[PDB]
Amino acid sequence: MNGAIKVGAWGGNGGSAFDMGPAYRIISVKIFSGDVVDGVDVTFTYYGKTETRHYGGSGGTPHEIVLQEGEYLVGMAGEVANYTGAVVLGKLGFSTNKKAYGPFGNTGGTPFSLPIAAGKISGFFGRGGKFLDAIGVYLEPLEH
Amino acid sequence: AIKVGAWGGNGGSAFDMGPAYRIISVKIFSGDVVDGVDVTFTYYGKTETRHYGGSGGTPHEIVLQEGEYLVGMAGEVANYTGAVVLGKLGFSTNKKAYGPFGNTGGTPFSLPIAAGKISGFFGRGGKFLDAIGVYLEPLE
Numbered sequence: 562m563n564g565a566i567k568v569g570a571w572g573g574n575g576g577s578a579f580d581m582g583p584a585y586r587i588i589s590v591k592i593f594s595g596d597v598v599d600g601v602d603v604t605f606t607y608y609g610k611t612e613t614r615h616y617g618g619s620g621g622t623p624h625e626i627v628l629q630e631g632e633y634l635v636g637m638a639g640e641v642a643n644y645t646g647a648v649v650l651g652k653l654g655f656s657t658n659k660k661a662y663g664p665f666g667n668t669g670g671t672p673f674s675l676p677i678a679a680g681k682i683s684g685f686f687g688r689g690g691k692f693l694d695a696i697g698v699y700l701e702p703l704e705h
Numbered sequence: 706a707i708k709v710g711a712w713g714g715n716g717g718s719a720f721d722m723g724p725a726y727r728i729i730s731v732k733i734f735s736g737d738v739v740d741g742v743d744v745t746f747t748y749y750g751k752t753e754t755r756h757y758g759g760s761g762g763t764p765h766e767i768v769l770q771e772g773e774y775l776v777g778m779a780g781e782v783a784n785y786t787g788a789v790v791l792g793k794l795g796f797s798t799n800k801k802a803y804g805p806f807g808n809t810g811g812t813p814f815s816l817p818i819a820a821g822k823i824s825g826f827f828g829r830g831g832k833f834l835d836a837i838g839v840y841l842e843p844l845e
């Protein structure tokens with residue numbers, strides 16, 4: 562709605578769908594991983610309020626991406642893996658205009674990659690259960 | 706503008722179609738790998754056809770009817786003749802999926818578009834289709 566662009570999700574069809582929408586300012590992403598990507602905390606601000614939403618399960622070790630002023634997400638990549646009979650994110654990483662993060666997770670499968678020649682990530686959607694079944698992103702231009 | 710990709714290598718020369726008002730058809734030229742593409746589209750009242758990459762292989766045309774649009778692109782980035790190029794390429798419309806076109810396996814990529822459409826292309830081309838990316842636009 563209202564001109565959104567959503568690409569993905571990459572991953573499986575298990576778990577429950579989630580959708581943050583494109584209206585919030587992402588300030589940090591915490592990826593929980595071990596053998597696979599267990600889940601993600603997305604922290605954002607909106608009208609001066611800070612909120613965190615958790616997607617996926619409770620396992621794994623956290624890895625944080627804390628955006629600095631003028632830093633934005635410009636890429637996402639990883640691997641879709643078969644794990645415990647589920648199709649989930651085995652690995653997940655991100656690029657900002659400042660550096661590369663991850664990938665986090667230790668199970669390979671089918672790679673995916675989202676290089677963004679022009680634009681940036683403005684929100685997330687996907688599916689979560691015990692692990693992070695799938696992830697996709699909202700996009701918006703770098704400026705205008 | 707929203708430009709995602711390109712997927713592929715760093716050889717050949719850069720190309721950039723820019724966005725179209727409507728894509729009418731795409732022809733994927735392929736053999737062992739993806740040789741190139743034709744794109745026929747409307748633009749500020751005009752109908753145009755552009756060719757990117759080489760013209761070896763055989764063309765595979767996808768014609769889009771009005772109300773039909775491109776909602777996915779996928780393929781494999783392969784190593785061929787000492788170059789990194791598109792080994793396979795396919796597209797999905799809101800009606801059906803087409804492809805793969807090309808026969809050389811490599812690193813897969815996929816671009817499902819949950820909301821939006823492909824409105825144009827950019828990338829690199831030489832003898833073959835070294836790299837390809839897309840312009841995205843929201844649905845009307």
Ligand SMILES: OC[C@H]1O[C@H](O[C@H]2[C@@H](O)[C@H](O)[C@@H](CO)O[C@@H]2O)[C@@H](O)[C@@H](O)[C@@H]1O
Pocket residue numbers: 574575576577644645646647648649689690691692693694
């Ligand atoms: O997030 C992955 C997966 O987690 C949960 O399922 C687990 C287990 O109960 C299932 O038997 C297997 C195979 O489906 O997968 C996991 O180990 C569920 O939340 C499931 O919906 C979800 O896909």
Ligand SMILES: OC[C@H]1O[C@H](O[C@H]2[C@@H](O)[C@H](O)[C@@H](CO)O[C@@H]2O)[C@@H](O)[C@@H](O)[C@@H]1O
Pocket residue numbers: 594595596597598599619620621622
């Ligand atoms: O990311 C999934 C899961 O990975 C790790 O656990 C694995 C292994 O190290 C454990 O020994 C066995 C126990 O049966 O479970 C997995 O195969 C941990 O990092 C875990 O927290 C995480 O959820």
Ligand SMILES: OC[C@H]1O[C@H](O[C@H]2[C@@H](O)[C@H](O)[C@@H](CO)O[C@@H]2O)[C@@H](O)[C@@H](O)[C@@H]1O
Pocket residue numbers: 715716717718786787788790830831832833834835
């Ligand atoms: O589009 C692929 C490739 O095409 C042309 O190069 C061909 C040949 O002349 C080269 O020897 C090998 C190795 O680079 O690749 C092709 O077979 C050039 O236009 C090149 O830049 C481009 O990558």
Ligand SMILES: OC[C@H]1O[C@H](O)[C@@H](O)[C@@H](O)[C@@H]1O
Pocket residue numbers: 735736737738739740761762763
């Ligand atoms: O796809 C690369 C190459 O593969 C084969 O050799 C033929 O189909 C050619 O016409 C084509 O150019």
